[PDB]
């Protein structure tokens, strides 16, 4: 029952498809300084999620 | 103490008699330094502060449409350009030194 | 009073996007 918070599992593969061990989490990351107009997003360069047909489970 | 070492990045303190009956001293202006936060510290703020991003210099990416001249009129010689003794000085450099967020 | 350049007075009803999917 430990580490199940934020994931679709009443009881605890690590825990579930959702990441229960992600590195960023609550603290965040110094991203406001890194965002800049010089570097940007190109054609079909959005993050690869399950909705976009990308098997992130693997 | 020579002007062209003392005023590398700031406008000269143009002396003007009015306001005084004796020797003029100077008057401060609102110009701000580019954002230079000390490295690694949290964005620490005691009270509401004027954001430097709202005061980015106009000479940032001013286009050099005229043959290599970001400045448009002769009024740069009385606004941006100052003759610091034996040297000439311009604030169009600050546009290159700062970022789009007014960061050095 | 500036010069009056002629202008066609076009007053027409503005009913627009009138469509209906066939049900029943």
């Amino acid at each position: 029952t430990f580490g199940i918070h934020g994931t679709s599992a009443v009881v605890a593969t690590d825990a579930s498809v959702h990441p229960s061990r992600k590195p960023i989490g609550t603290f965040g990351r110094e991203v406001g300084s890194t965002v800049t107009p010089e570097i940007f997003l190109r054609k079909n360069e959005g993050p690869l999620t399950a909705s976009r047909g990308a098997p992130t489970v693997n | 103490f020579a002007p062209e070492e003392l005023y590398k990045n700031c406008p000269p303190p143009v002396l003007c008699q009015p306001g005084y009956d004796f020797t003029p001293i100077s008057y401060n202006t609102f110009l701000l330094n580019p954002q230079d936060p000390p490295h690694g510290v949290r964005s620490v703020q005691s009270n509401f502060m004027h954001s430097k991003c709202d005061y980015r210099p106009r000479s940032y990416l001013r286009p050099e449409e005229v043959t290599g001249t970001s400045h448009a009129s002769r009024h740069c010689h009385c606004n941006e350009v100052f003759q610091l003794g034996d040297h000439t000085m311009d604030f169009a450099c600050e546009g290159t030194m700062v970022d789009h967020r007014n960061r050095l | 009073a500036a010069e009056h350049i002629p202008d066609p007075y076009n007053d027409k009803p503005n009913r627009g996007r009138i469509w209906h999917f066939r049900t029943g």
Partner: protein
Amino acid sequence: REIVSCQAGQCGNQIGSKFWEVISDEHGVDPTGTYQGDSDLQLERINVYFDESSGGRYVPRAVLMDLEPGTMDSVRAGPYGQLFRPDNFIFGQSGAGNNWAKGHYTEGAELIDSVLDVCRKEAESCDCLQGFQLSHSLGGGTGSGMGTLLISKLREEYPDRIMMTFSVIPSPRVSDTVVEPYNTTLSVHQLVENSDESMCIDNEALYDICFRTLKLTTPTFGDLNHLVAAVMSGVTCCLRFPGQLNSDLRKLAVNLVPFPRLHFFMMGFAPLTSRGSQQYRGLSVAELTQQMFDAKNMMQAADPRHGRYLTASALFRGRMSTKEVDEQMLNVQNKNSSYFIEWIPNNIKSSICDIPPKGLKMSVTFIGNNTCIQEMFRRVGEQFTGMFRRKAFLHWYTGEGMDEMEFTEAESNMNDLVSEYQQYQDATV
């Protein structure tokens, strides 16, 4: 299980404020925060949109976003501004200046750190986050710019979580911005690869509801914002209330998005009758399914005859039987096969929720992935090309650091999007 809401820009903040008014309606939450709901069905899933407090009150799980403090001012001083958490209010010293570049790279970048802070706490303080919701307009400066910055900046940190945008799409006839094509394109190319669902709301349809459907004497932004708010409440009523055929935002996305880039939808609300004509309308399942596909009740101004329906979603609220709703909804396809995609059987998915909105017999929210969206995308692309052709207001964007081929890449993305729309429109078996 929970949806965390974000409002961006003047339009987004106003729409979200009156949307939270609507949510407090059927969750029985006072402006102060105290719950006086008459039934506990309003408290059953109040955690989806509200986070409880020690005093028995509930806080919207919403973060506010605007370089202009004026919209926060109006929202907080309004009737339901008591409800919002104070620290979630994030604002700067100067407005966006109606510039996507300023809202996305210069003024928004130095401000989005706190936004990430607040949204991350609001996102990981819940038991199981179902998704993210954003409300903004694509023609604005901080609603579009900072909104898309938030969207792209949250997508990477929460890839598996569903994230949707209630984009209030602009139009030249109601153009209150001349940088409208620039902002719309720069926002939409980000939303294409950064949003699971990007539902579109159009001001011309909003106002044509106020005349041709409502006959209102003095229609206002309050009425328009309540239309958008009712859309927002209907799209997620099934999560908050029980129903015969439950659905969630993931199921809606699966049933409405056939291909990853095909996530822009028509919207519509029903029942909507003028206050003087509500006597004579026999409000029933047939009448609601007629009003779904009636022009007077669509939330975006485009002609569906020129296009084809890939998929649609019908979220019904109220006490009904599935027996007549499913047969009606197949009935419409049977005789409108000339306007529906053939190679997909049963293009429309229905969902039934028992609890209806307060003061309504029965409601229905219509979400349509129609292929007529390419018409309006072409319309905005033509003006974007015309403006980009002559540096038309281009220097404002380029002086904030954006490179000139950003616009070329955005227009290439839009051209690919409309080409895909057209080729899935005319694709045959």
